[PDB]
């Protein structure tokens with residue numbers, strides 16, 4: 745069979761995480777189900793640093809990637825997007841005792857920690873290009889999401905933008921009960937997608953076909969409830 749290597753950096757829970765030395769989480773199990781009993785393909789998951797996920801797709805080292813990945817035009821120019829597999833809205837996190845940040849309009853002169861090449865880093869970089877008189881303070885980090893949330897709770901900086909499921913998960917698991925969650929709007933549907941290397945066109949056709957099948961047989965809903973506690977799926981009409 746043809747071996748398909750799926751890369752991930754291992755964050756964030758419950759989309760991706762490790763248990764007993766092995767990768768699991770919603771996206772990992774959705775991909776396992778896509779290839780289960782495939783007469784053509786065998787799947788293998790590999791954990792690598794974040795920058796390595798994209799660099800590996802670029803070099804054709806990896807066939808696919810799952811990593812709580814959002815859509816952007818820039819990514820679409822370099823990689824293929826499979827059908828979406830989850831819907832998860834954006835949020836702004838601040839300390840509950842801080843009344844100075846109530847929306848995304850209040851981040852000027854305030855500090856955060858962001859990861860290179862993420863959609864939130866790109867949004868904030870663009871915010872700074874527009875608001876040159878009072879930019880937000882970005883400190884880039886290679887730490888993963890949980891660590892960043894802990895630092896926010898520790899008072900190391902003022903706010904953090906991320907998504908609902910990832911934020912709620914860390915607030916519950918890490919007991920970060922001093923953090924307040926503010927809903928944020930979205931221009932586009934906040935969907936999460938597997939990405940494939942450019943040229944993996946035949947693979948994309950198979951993956952897309954399987955994602956639709958797993959939606960129809962109830963597997964996506966089953967896995968969503970298992971990992972997230974409720975159904976967080978794209979509308980059926982957008983699953984393509």
Ligand SMILES: N[C@@H](CCC(=O)N[C@@H](CS)C(=O)NCC(=O)O)C(=O)O
Nearest residue numbers: 755756794812813814859862863889
């Ligand atoms: N949905 C966003 C974030 C993806 C994501 O969850 N990245 C992982 C690995 S770098 C993470 O833990 N991010 C933490 C963060 O962006 O603070 C994107 O597509 O860029």
